[PDB]
Design an enzyme around this catalytic site. Structure first.
Site, short mmCIF file in Angstrom:
data_model
loop_
_atom_site.label_atom_id
_atom_site.label_comp_id
_atom_site.label_asym_id
_atom_site.label_seq_id
_atom_site.Cartn_x
_atom_site.Cartn_y
_atom_site.Cartn_z
N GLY A 102 0.78 -1.23 0.00
CA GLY A 102 0.00 0.00 0.00
C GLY A 102 0.82 1.28 0.00
O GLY A 102 1.85 1.41 -0.66
N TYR A 112 -11.33 2.14 14.36
CA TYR A 112 -10.36 2.61 13.38
C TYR A 112 -10.41 4.12 13.24
O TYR A 112 -9.37 4.79 13.25
CB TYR A 112 -10.59 1.94 12.04
#
Ligand SMILES: NC(=O)C1=CN([C@@H]2O[C@H](COP(=O)(O)OP(=O)(O)OC[C@H]3O[C@@H](n4cnc5c(N)ncnc54)[C@H](OP(=O)(O)O)[C@@H]3O)[C@@H](O)[C@H]2O)C=CC1
Length: 301
Positions: free
Chosen positions: A13, A175
């Protein structure tokens, strides 16, 4: 002589393509990853020059592993110019919380608490470096995130506590909560240390990187279609290469040396960075400070 930068979560990523962009600029990248084989396979698939990177083990969910990595890096005898806190985990649909070896809910433990200890230890190395353009860069954000009054941290953040505000467990909000802590940490880093160290403390939002393994815990159909959705509907899509390049700009480009700032290019993408002051929310000033203090307590400082 290559300037050295530590990037956490560099095996895929944004962190992987940030490693490639910084390596192509002449930096030496410390790929701090928990999966050594996965990281090495990722760098070779991209043909990142092996003399531009070195891979060290780092498990941000283990505070002992964080301390161990710091020793491993110091044994390299390399002066540190920059640290990128990039790694993260995202569980959108996790029913029951997972607790790290140190006893903390895994999303906050990995995304915030492990990085918080790493930052405080590596601050010494950034201070002692003779480089004049040193930066600490945190990956930030743009169920809404709500830290409440930090009740979960105030009470020790051990099971059955699973949220910073003490409410019952929500994996997706956990998150969002953890990335909010990243922003507040970047805000506290600047307030506490910029005038006295000259280190640049910034956060950044590169856009919606819809392709990354951040969504590995999402439904398989989501991972397949989210890029097209983000590409053809919201227009917020950014490629992994462009996100990595934007990390490299904030680390290395001179146009990004202002401290205490959040860099972004918008929700919807065009084809020019925006400046946002991290201390903008004046009403979060005390919560930011208490978050710092509670985090020092949770990681053993
Ligand atoms: N993707 C997006 O659209 C956006 C992402 N971001 C931020 O970008 C950053 C990169 O995430 P992204 O690249 O998107 O998704 P990735 O999953 O590709 O990057 C996640 C990285 O974190 C690492 N990691 C996870 N848990 C740990 C751990 N306990 N110890 C060490 N490393 C760990 C992963 O390694 P492993 O594979 O071994 O877990 C991986 O290298 C994140 O901080 C995310 O919040 C911000 C805005 C938008």
């Amino acid at each position: 002589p290559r300037p050295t930068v530590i990037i956490t979560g560099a095996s895929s990523g944004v962190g992987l393509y940030a490693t490639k962009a910084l390596a192509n600029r002449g930096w030496h990248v410390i790929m701090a990853c928990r999966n050594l084989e996965k990281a090495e396979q990722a760098a070779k698939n991209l043909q990142i020059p092996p003399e531009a990177y070195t891979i060290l083990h780092l498990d941000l969910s283990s505070l002992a592993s964080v301390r161990g990595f710091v020793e491993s890096f110091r044994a390299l005898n390399r002066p540190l110019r920059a640290l990128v806190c990039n790694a993260a985990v995202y569980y959108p649909l996790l029913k029951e919380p997972i607790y790290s070896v140190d006893g903390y809910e895994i999303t906050v433990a990995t995304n915030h608490l492990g990085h918080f200890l790493l930052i405080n230890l590596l601050l010494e190395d950034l201070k002692n470096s003779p480089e004049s353009d040193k930066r600490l860069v945190i990956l930030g954000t743009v169920a809404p995130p709500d830290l409440g009054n930090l009740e979960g941290f105030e009470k020790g953040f051990k099971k059955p506590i699973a949220m910073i505000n003490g409410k019952p467990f929500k994996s997706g909000k956990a998150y969002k909560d953890s990335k909010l802590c990243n922003m507040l940490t970047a805000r506290e880093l600047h307030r506490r240390f910029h005038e006295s160290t000259g280190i640049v403390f910034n956060s950044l939002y590169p856009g919606c990187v819809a392709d990354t393994p951040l969504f590995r815990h999402h439904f398989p159909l989501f991972q397949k279609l989210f890029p097209l959705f983000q590409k053809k509907i919201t227009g917020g899509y950014v490629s992994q290469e462009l996100a990595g390049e934007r990390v490299a700009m904030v680390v290395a480009d001179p146009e990004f040396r202002q401290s205490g700032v959040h860099w972004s290019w918008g929700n919807r993408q065009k084809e020019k960075a925006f400046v946002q002051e991290l201390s903008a929310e004046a009403s979060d000033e005390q919560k930011a400070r208490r978050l710092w203090e509670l985090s020092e307590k949770l990681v053993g400082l």
